[PDB]
Design a protein around this motif. Structure first.
Motif, PDB file in Angstrom:
ATOM      1  N   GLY A  56       0.823  -1.216   0.000  1.00 14.48           N
ATOM      2  CA  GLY A  56       0.000   0.000   0.000  1.00 14.48           C
ATOM      3  C   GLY A  56       0.855   1.264   0.000  1.00 14.48           C
ATOM      4  O   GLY A  56       0.284   2.352   0.160  1.00 14.48           O
ATOM      5  N   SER A  82     -11.848  -6.861   0.089  1.00  9.38           N
ATOM      6  CA  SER A  82     -12.075  -5.540   0.712  1.00  9.38           C
ATOM      7  C   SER A  82     -10.734  -4.888   1.076  1.00  9.38           C
ATOM      8  O   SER A  82     -10.520  -3.712   0.737  1.00  9.38           O
ATOM      9  CB  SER A  82     -12.955  -5.677   1.917  1.00  9.38           C
ATOM     10  N   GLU A  83      -9.873  -5.607   1.785  1.00 14.78           N
ATOM     11  CA  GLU A  83      -8.611  -5.014   2.284  1.00 14.78           C
ATOM     12  C   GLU A  83      -7.643  -4.853   1.103  1.00 14.78           C
ATOM     13  O   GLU A  83      -6.894  -3.864   1.064  1.00 14.78           O
ATOM     14  CB  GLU A  83      -8.086  -5.839   3.463  1.00 14.78           C
ATOM     15  N   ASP A  85      -8.537  -4.236  -1.989  1.00 17.42           N
ATOM     16  CA  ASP A  85      -9.014  -3.037  -2.714  1.00 17.42           C
ATOM     17  C   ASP A  85      -8.465  -1.783  -2.044  1.00 17.42           C
ATOM     18  O   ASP A  85      -7.997  -0.884  -2.794  1.00 17.42           O
ATOM     19  CB  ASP A  85     -10.537  -3.013  -2.783  1.00 17.42           C
ATOM     20  N   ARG A  86      -8.529  -1.696  -0.706  1.00 16.43           N
ATOM     21  CA  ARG A  86      -8.060  -0.527   0.068  1.00 16.43           C
ATOM     22  C   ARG A  86      -6.545  -0.327  -0.164  1.00 16.43           C
ATOM     23  O   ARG A  86      -6.116   0.810  -0.421  1.00 16.43           O
ATOM     24  CB  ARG A  86      -8.382  -0.722   1.547  1.00 16.43           C
ATOM     25  N   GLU A  87      -5.754  -1.392  -0.059  1.00 13.28           N
ATOM     26  CA  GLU A  87      -4.279  -1.291  -0.207  1.00 13.28           C
ATOM     27  C   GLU A  87      -3.949  -0.888  -1.643  1.00 13.28           C
ATOM     28  O   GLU A  87      -2.960  -0.176  -1.830  1.00 13.28           O
ATOM     29  CB  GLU A  87      -3.626  -2.631   0.126  1.00 13.28           C
ATOM     30  N   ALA A  90      -4.500   2.696  -2.016  1.00 11.97           N
ATOM     31  CA  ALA A  90      -3.476   3.421  -1.242  1.00 11.97           C
ATOM     32  C   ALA A  90      -2.155   3.459  -2.041  1.00 11.97           C
ATOM     33  O   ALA A  90      -1.502   4.496  -2.047  1.00 11.97           O
ATOM     34  CB  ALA A  90      -3.299   2.819   0.133  1.00 11.97           C
ATOM     35  N   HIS A 130      -8.424   2.869  -9.888  1.00 12.23           N
ATOM     36  CA  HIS A 130      -7.631   3.375  -8.745  1.00 12.23           C
ATOM     37  C   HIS A 130      -6.494   4.255  -9.279  1.00 12.23           C
ATOM     38  O   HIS A 130      -6.127   5.249  -8.640  1.00 12.23           O
ATOM     39  CB  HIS A 130      -7.154   2.197  -7.902  1.00 12.23           C
TER      40      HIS A 130
END
Ligand SMILES: [Cl-]
Ligand SMILES: [Cl-]
Ligand SMILES: [Cl-]
Length: 163
Positions: A56, A82-83, A85-87, A90, A130
């Motif tokens: 990330g 979910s995690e 996608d977030r990383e 980031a 992203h």
């Protein structure tokens, strides 16, 4: 900044880019790796001195005066959707910060987490969106590098859709 900041896509080795800096699809340990990472290692091995950085994040290391931005996307084999996608979001925001800090007018960027970190899924749209979310506020010319002819068409279509 570029006079009329653009997005483009090319189907070729990112190690042969024509931009002022390159984003590596790095691993967290600064290892030579496979795919884009191995091509980057072969072209700019000096840039792997203390390039290790968490998932990330992005860490820039100079090869002479040429900046290599080591961006670590998640391996979706290991992360939840979910995690992961977030990383992935980031890592691209950290790339935007680095591109801005460097003051470059252009950057060569691969789609993070779309190869051996994809967890066997097509993540073109997820990764590209992203990339757009992070890079849209920058004024560098962005040149996306890919190796598949059908990915080239789909990335080219997504760029043109917004123009
Ligand atoms: Cl090539
Ligand atoms: Cl990957
Ligand atoms: Cl590709």
């Amino acid at each position: 900044g570029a006079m009329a900041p653009s997005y483009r896509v090319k189907r070729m080795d990112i190690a042969k880019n024509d931009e002022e800096c390159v984003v590596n699809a790095a691993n967290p340990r600064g290892l030579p790796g496979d795919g884009v990472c191995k091509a980057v290692y072969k072209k700019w091995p000096e840039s792997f001195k203390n390039s290790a950085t968490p998932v990330g994040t992005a860490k820039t290391v100079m090869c002479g005066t040429y900046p290599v931005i080591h961006a670590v996307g998640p391996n979706f084999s290991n992360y939840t959707e979910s995690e992961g996608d977030r990383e992935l979001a980031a890592a691209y925001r950290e790339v935007a910060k680095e591109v801005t800090r460097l003051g470059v007018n252009s950057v060569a960027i691969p789609l993070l987490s779309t190869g051996v970190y994809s967890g066997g899924k097509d993540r073109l749209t997820q990764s590209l969106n992203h990339l757009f979310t992070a890079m849209d506020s920058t004024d560098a010319d962005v040149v996306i590098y890919c190796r598949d002819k059908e990915w080239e068409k789909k990335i080219s279509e997504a760029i043109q859709m917004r123009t």
